[PDB]
């Protein structure tokens, strides 16, 4: 009974989807964690059968999605959400979308899981180069793109079986310079890669859990097009 | 024409393996890292980029 | 008591993953790299060592 | 129709064996490359059932060894063998044990293969520290442990299908200093890791073949006990 939570899926054009698809070949149950801003658009296109084509695993296999929950990696617990987003149009009708809440939520309905995927990143000033990125934009990139991994781990470790595995997605811009990859995203990836090592020590020694990071090549994803450079 | 198109075009022309990189290419590798098949691998940065990262100087 | 015994005792005490490294652990990873599942990986050095390589300073 | 040639086996206590075991799980035909000096002893133990238990693939499966051939990685072609070995009691009752010769032999008997494993290493002065290693020992270590990979690729690429895969075994002593790993073995591994990158370029561009190297942790094997320090 393999259960995987994929955090960071807004459509079928990204890596989160290719991962989901491949996991299905091995018959693992998939739980999607969708960002609230695009949660309804995703659910809509899904119900209207606009993804049925993409859910084909060639071998007649139909992609089996266990659940689809709203999730925002910038909020650790319920009282971390600010009044503004709390009343925002796209958030008002949703609940239990913080990191702690989705962990508790998944634990109640399905119990312990054994696979976790961190497939998200965000940066307000990705269009500006490092030198011109503000402190606010920079810390926002790391808060969303890097710390969210540490947080997911801290909360999901309680609902994960021993010998479980965790992965995230990084980019080479962290080791070698690629102009255009701004807003502190290169910074966020360098941090994430270093944190993978440290977490690998703590998670391995205390929970006998593993964590690795995949450094992928270029893929024309929705967020990849955001990088106007 | 945005950073992404340049990166994709650059990869497909200079990587050791000249083929389009699919999301499922990363998917199967992710699948392996999540299974017990890799019980001895942890804390690593695994490159799935048709080997572009090993290059220093492009060809032409 | 021979180079290998020291390295192994050390690995099992300080590596992030405190488990015995079996030849089949390396075997399963080799198996994956030799299969088409890893078509996007080439020219890499993959570490199958329970993560010892990430350590700098030991606990004890 | 997968066939894998494993260069570097003398017993069931090393990495070559573990790799063979795991590959069998996936139904791949295995061909062992045995170093002439221990070839006959190996066949003896094989014939006397001394390896039978070690060939049981958990799931009631039996390891499927297609063939076993004498193989010496220090000889590229037939006219590379000197008198001293050409008259050695061991290499006498043997023929076709050079890299080019076994590749032709395999191609003739089984056709093309699509998997190659380089799992051999040797160093005359592995007991001495780098500073005290002679030019002779140092080169012998790089000849047997490093160049052998390049030669394997050069000759086997002709009997391999497109999209074939190659791997070798390396050790972290190449990147960080571990006292006791002498005789130029750390130097040879450093070269093997660099060559893997370069070969990846040539093999990937010209034949669409992949090559990687696995840096393994300690394992109590025969050649591992050989290291005295
Ligand atoms: N596309 C590439 O060329 C490329 C290359 C290397 C690494 N990566 C990494 O792949 C991962 C996925 O990116 P992708 O490129 O497939 O794009 P993607 O746009 O499909 O995925 C990113 C997802 O994160 C979600 N997101 C943003 N802020 C969030 C928040 N606060 N909480 C939760 N979800 C949030 C979005 O809905 C989006 O679906 C990223 O971590 C990225 O850094 C991508
Ligand atoms: N055991 C470890 O702790 C360890 C760690 C990291 C990397 N490695 C690597 O794993 C590989 C396999 O080594 P192992 O330690 O499992 O030992 P092993 O003793 O089973 O394998 C090495 C083989 O090389 C063969 N050999 C020597 N000279 C040869 C020649 N001229 N031609 C062909 N074969 C020849 C030997 O017969 C032997 O079987 C080596 O390349 C080693 O560097 C091992
Ligand atoms: O991390 C990447 C590397 C190359 C191309 C695209 C991405 N992804 C990305 C960028 C910027 C932002 Cl704000 C969000 C994401 Cl998911
Ligand atoms: O490469 C290694 C690392 C740690 C322990 C053992 C080995 N293998 C090895 C050593 C020395 C010699 Cl001469 C041959 C071999 Cl295969």
UniProtKB/TrEMBL annotation, chains A, D:
Pathway connected to this protein: Lipid metabolism; fatty acid biosynthesis
Swiss-Prot/TrEMBL keywords: Fatty acid biosynthesis, Fatty acid metabolism, Lipid biosynthesis, Lipid metabolism, Nucleotide-binding, Oxidoreductase, Signal
Top-level taxon: Eukaryota
Binding residue positions for NADH: 10, 15, 35, 72-73, 120, 189, 219, 221, 223
Residues binding NAD(+) 1: 8, 10, 15, 35, 72-74, 120-122, 169, 189, 219, 221-223
UniProt-recorded Gene Ontology molecular function terms: enoyl-[acyl-carrier-protein] reductase (NADH) activity; nucleotide binding
Family membership noted in the UniProt record: Belongs to the short-chain dehydrogenases/reductases (SDR) family. FabI subfamily.
Protein name: Enoyl-ACP reductase
Organism of this sequence: Plasmodium falciparum (malaria parasite P. falciparum)
